[PDB]
């Protein structure tokens, strides 16, 4: 037996363990939405759990006793069992083998045939008892509240104080009631990630709440942080059409990049003659780079290693050489030293990765490895990514060397020692530098990413060669020249792209959005409201009822509620009237709204005043025969509140460190 009911305002619990009094607090958490659709059961498979469960029961005899939680409930995984005797409450998480229709035998254990590996145990007018179970993080949180009533779910208000929090990290997907021929009835609802405005009174008790996404009036209340709304029009929020599907478009490339022959080289080159290899027209899977060399981690500048598989690069360059430990810090932008000045220089705007690993086993000889040399003398510093393999004799002094070494005439290159007994800082290190040309031309190196089909004229999440975004893709008239790959706008936003597979042009447009204002008389007068969608025709007003068409989950009836089209936008919920009155709630473009007689909200063209033709003629004059003494009142502000601010007390209240830091700011 399954009936249905509205939850009304039931299911509000204290979101934290902080005392608050006489305050309105906005909290986003898993709450039971107001006026939701709860299921009523009478006394049988297992219900789903979803994100949380609100259980309720009105009783006077305590027939319902416990609960069961888990995923499969067949002793293959841990399951939660909660029972309670007349005095004690027993909670276990054993791997029970539950019966098909468990029930406590009026004690016994007919519920479960087996129970092994118990990893947690805990022991501790009608009456309406309400419980909330949620299994976030590694805690099973149970909130409870029982109140006397004289009704399924009374329209009053009652917060649910937290009862128990269990540190069990159990995964839960299904649950079932438990009771001790008899009859019983109970209500079940499901929690959702909602934002609420809670009202803590003087004693710290939650006395009222507002569900910010229930309807436009509640959204207005949450925006104003108040439970009462004065008459007027309030710019509440923005409506936005959500994307429907995801599109990925990458070049159709099959070859795997040759990263094996870079890291797995028999002998790396000397730093003064560093090797450079070009990687292009291949798919690069950097996650395998950890298998080729025993390096500890990347050192990536301008990019994060974990993201390297999500990007496309026009070209990649692998520069390989061997240095010693002291000089590994010089392979970085903005460095100076022998290696940075005379051997290998990286630009200050370097965007790439550096991979250096110790190779003392391969590059060291007992007598000393002298195959690796570095340039020690040079006239001037190297330009970035410049190689200098010259061996001309360096002239230190004024005497020309004439190709002969001597005093102030040195051989520019010197060999490393590289003996296995040296310390860590003097041992050889193999260095591979990956330089990414980034994406401006047709990308030739891309991460492993399956490309989907192309969807046009819809709000989609697109990913063109790693350029991600959300919008509508339309066929474009822009005359791209063959070398171009995308077009930009005034704000340097990508306005058009080139599909890598079919070399066509696609315009990118923001999906759909606009401002949403709420026209309302005072809440002391009525809860009836109208909605103004600003600057939209009354056809782009989002009508589709789903979770991919609107940021505001509420949807004022777009057909039955009398729609009207003003130059300000589309007005829903107000009936246009051919009469003209004084402006009460200004909507715009000469249109105002008011709450008038049943009573409803009416929109009209504002009235400037009564017309009055003056009986003018060239020999007629109107002269007053009497007068009137009028006393009018004019109010003028003169002064305002004189305020003083203690800068240190406000910014750094009772903090010496903060005050000393604040002294630095002039």
């Amino acid at each position: 037996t399954q009936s249905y009911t509205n939850s009304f305002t039931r299911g509000v619990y204290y979101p934290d363990k902080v005392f608050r009094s006489s305050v309105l607090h906005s909290t986003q958490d898993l709450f039971l939405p107001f006026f939701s659709n709860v299921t009523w059961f009478h006394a049988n498979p297992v219900l789903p759990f979803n994100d949380g469960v609100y259980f309720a029961s009105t009783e006077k005899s305590n027939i319902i006793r416990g609960w069961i939680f888990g995923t499969t409930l067949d002793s293959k995984t841990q399951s939660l069992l909660i029972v309670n005797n007349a005095t004690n409450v027993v909670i276990k998480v054993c791997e029970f083998q539950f019966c098909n229709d468990p029930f406590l035998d009026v004690s016994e254990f007919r519920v479960y045939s087996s129970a092994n590996n118990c990893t947690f145990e805990y022991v501790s007018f009608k009456n309406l008892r309400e419980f909330v179970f949620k299994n976030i993080d590694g805690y099973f949180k149970i909130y409870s509240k029982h109140t006397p009533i004289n009704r399924d779910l009374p329209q009053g208000f009652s917060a649910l104080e937290p009862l128990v929090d269990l540190p069990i990290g159990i995964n839960i997907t299904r649950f079932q009631t438990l009771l001790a021929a008899g009859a019983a009835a109970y209500y079940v609802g499901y929690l959702q990630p909602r934002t609420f405005l809670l009202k803590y009174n003087e004693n710290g008790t939650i006395t009222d709440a507002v569900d910010c996404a229930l309807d436009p009036l509640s959204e207005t209340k949450c925006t104003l942080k108040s439970f009462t709304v004065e008459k007027g029009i309030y710019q509440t929020s923005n409506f936005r059409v959500q994307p429907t599907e995801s599109i990925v478009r990458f070049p159709n490339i099959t070859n795997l990049c040759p990263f094996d022959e870079v890291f797995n080289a028999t002998r790396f080159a000397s730093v003064y003659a560093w090797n450079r290899k070009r990687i292009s027209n291949c798919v690069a899977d950097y996650s395998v780079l950890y298998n080729f060399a025993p390096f500890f981690a990347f050192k990536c500048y301008g990019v994060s290693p974990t993201k390297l598989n999500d990007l496309c690069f026009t070209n990649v360059y692998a520069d390989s050489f061997v240095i010693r430990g002291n000089e590994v810090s010089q392979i970085a932008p903005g460095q100076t030293g022998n290696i940075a000045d005379y051997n290998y220089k990286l630009p200050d705007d370097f965007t790439g990765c550096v991979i250096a690993w110790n190779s003392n086993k391969l590059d060291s000889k007992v007598g000393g490895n002298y195959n690796y040399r570095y340039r020690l003398f040079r006239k001037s510093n190297l330009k970035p990514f410049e190689r200098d393999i010259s061996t001309e004799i360096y002239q230190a002094g004024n005497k020309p060397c004439n190709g002969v070494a001597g005093v102030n005439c040195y051989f520019p290159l010197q060999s490393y020692g590289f003996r296995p007994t040296y310390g860590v800082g003097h041992q050889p290190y193999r260095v591979v530098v990956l330089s990414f040309e980034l994406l401006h031309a047709p990308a030739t190196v891309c991460g492993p990413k399956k490309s989907t089909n192309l969807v046009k004229n819809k709000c989609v999440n697109f990913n063109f060669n790693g350029l991600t975004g959300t919008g509508v893709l339309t066929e474009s008239n822009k005359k791209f020249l063959p070398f171009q790959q995308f077009g930009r706008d005034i704000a340097d936003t990508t306005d058009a792209v080139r599909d890598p597979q079919t070399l066509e042009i696609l315009d990118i447009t923001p999906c759909s959005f606009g401002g949403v204002s709420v026209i309302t008389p005072g809440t002391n007068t009525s809860n009836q409201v109208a909605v103004l969608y600003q600057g939209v025709n009354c056809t782009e007003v989002p009508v589709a009822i789903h979770a991919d068409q609107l940021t505001p989950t509420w949807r004022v009836y777009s057909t039955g509620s009398n729609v009207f089209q003003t130059r300000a936008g589309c007005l829903i919920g107000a009936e246009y009237v051919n009469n003209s009155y004084e402006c009460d709630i200004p909507i715009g473009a000469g249109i105002c709204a008011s709450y008038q007689t049943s009573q409803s909200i009416i929109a009209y063209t504002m009235s400037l005043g009564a017309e009055n033709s003056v009986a003018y003629s060239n020999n007629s004059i109107a002269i007053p025969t009497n007068f009137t003494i009028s006393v009018t009142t004019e109010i003028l502000p003169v002064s305002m509140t004189k305020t003083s601010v203690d800068c240190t007390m406000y910014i750094c209240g009772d903090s010496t460190e903060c005050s000393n830091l604040l002294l630095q700011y002039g």
Partner: antibody, heavy 121, light 110 residues
Framework: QVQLVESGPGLVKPSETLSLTCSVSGGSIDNFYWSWIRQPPGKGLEWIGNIYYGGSGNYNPSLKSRVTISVDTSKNQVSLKLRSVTAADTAVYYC???????????????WGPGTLVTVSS | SVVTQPASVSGSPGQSITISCTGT?????????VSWFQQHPGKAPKLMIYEVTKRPSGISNRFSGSKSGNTASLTISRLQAEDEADYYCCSYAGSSTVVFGGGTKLTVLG
């Protein structure tokens, strides 16, 4: 799996307006690009235009001053209208649809059998 | 028609023939969006090649497509009797415009 069937008058006098309706079976209008093409007897194919439910309507520049293509989702059909019909318009007309894997104006995949239209009195 | 095709071509059963499709740099040399259609007399055109090289499901691998410069080529290997029909090339011309070729009539010597 969709089938497109053309219908309309087979005779149009010169300087009149020619109307054709393509009916879709086994599928819906949705967001597909519905295209109209024509072929004179014994001559090559000539692309006329296309339209999707979003709007606008892209026509051949040689004919855009006369062609109007529309789509009706409620009746689930495509409408083609050609004004100032001359004797050169005597041809077999086809409607075509793009697929999900070839979306766009270039998606001429599912063709109808065609309908012959002759221009004379 | 901007796109140009040879008027006719002949071949013997067994050998491979090629049908050319010469356009400009704005229709064929700009996009990988060339389609090849086969039309028998009295029948609607049948899509044989789409996106320059891709074959729709149900089409024999004897038909292959390629593009070079401003010319798209359809290669038919192992000519058979039923392959004798008209062949057209359609190309996306930009700004949501499609241009058809003049049409080529294949002849089978068999």
């Amino acid at each position: 799996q969709v089938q497109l069937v053309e219908s309309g008058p087979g005779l149009v006098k010169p300087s009149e307006t020619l109307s054709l309706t393509c009916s879709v079976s086994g599928g819906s209008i949705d967001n597909f690009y519905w295209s109209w093409i024509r072929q004179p007897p014994g001559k090559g194919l000539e692309w006329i235009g296309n339209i999707y439910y979003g709007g606008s309507g892209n026509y051949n520049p040689s004919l855009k001053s006369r062609v109007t293509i529309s789509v009706d989702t409620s009746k689930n059909q495509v409408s083609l209208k050609l004004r100032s019909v001359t004797a050169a318009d005597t041809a077999v007309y086809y409607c075509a649809r793009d697929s999900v894997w070839y979306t766009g104006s270039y998606g001429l995949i599912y063709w109808g059998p065609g309908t012959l239209v002759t221009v004379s009195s | 028609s901007v796109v140009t095709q040879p008027a006719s071509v002949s071949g013997s059963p067994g050998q491979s023939i090629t049908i050319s499709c010469t356009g400009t740099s704005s229709d064929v040399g700009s996009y990988n969006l060339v389609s090849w259609f086969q039309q028998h007399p009295g029948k609607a055109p049948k899509l044989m090649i789409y996106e320059v090289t891709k074959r729709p499901s149900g089409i024999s691998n004897r038909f292959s497509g390629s593009k070079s410069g401003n010319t798209a080529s359809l290669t038919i290997s192992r000519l058979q009797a039923e392959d004798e029909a008209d062949y057209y090339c359609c190309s996306y011309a930009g700004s949501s415009t499609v241009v058809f070729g003049g049409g080529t009539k294949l002849t089978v010597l068999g």
